[PDB]
Ligand binder design. Sequence first.
Ligand code: HEM
Ligand SMILES: [Xe]
Ligand SMILES: [Xe]
Ligand SMILES: [Xe]
Ligand SMILES: [Xe]
Ligand SMILES: [Xe]
Ligand SMILES: [Xe]
Ligand SMILES: [Xe]
Ligand SMILES: [Xe]
Length: 148
Amino acid sequence: RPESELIRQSWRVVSRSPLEHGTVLFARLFALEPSLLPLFQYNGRQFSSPEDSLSSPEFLDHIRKVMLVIDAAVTNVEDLSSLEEYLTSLGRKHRAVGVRLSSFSTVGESLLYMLEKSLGPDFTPATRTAWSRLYGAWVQAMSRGWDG
Ligand code: HEM
Ligand SMILES: [Xe]
Ligand SMILES: [Xe]
Ligand SMILES: [Xe]
Ligand SMILES: [Xe]
Ligand SMILES: [Xe]
Ligand SMILES: [Xe]
Ligand SMILES: [Xe]
Ligand SMILES: [Xe]
């Protein structure tokens, strides 16, 4: 099925410059859910305002990490069974870190916003609903980290 090629096609534009695009992603996220900010604790300090995050090298490395894990999920768009065991542990990591299950709908909304603003004309509704089901599956797997 070329639902998996809508994704691969949309991703190649984005994956051209991942840090620029993942910066869009996290600016949108904090605009939607300001209380996600304090969970990025590096040397036990809390950023005051969203813009403080953009000067932090650790924060920017975490962006590069987000974009590599999305890249991996793309690279396995049919058989996301490979990544399950990893995504589960990635979930549990984020549970320890303080992330709550409800914050996934926000991360999802931010991913779509970033895709939408990046592809403009090409973000067609089949593309949206593709990313939307992929993301839903990435989410099911990550959720095992909260205990099934
Ligand atoms: C939703 C808000 C998020 C918050 C608040 C958050 C916060 C954190 C924190 C505090 C860490 C540990 C310190 C660090 O490695 O930089 C971390 C690690 C990580 N995050 Fe996130 N994160 C979020 C979302 C995500 C998403 C969506 C992905 C991937 C799609 C992601 C991928 C990772 C990866 C790969 C690591 C490294 C984990 C390890 O191997 O130890 N994070 N995150
Ligand atoms: Xe940001
Ligand atoms: Xe920001
Ligand atoms: Xe890293
Ligand atoms: Xe990256
Ligand atoms: Xe990437
Ligand atoms: Xe997350
Ligand atoms: Xe994501
Ligand atoms: Xe994803």
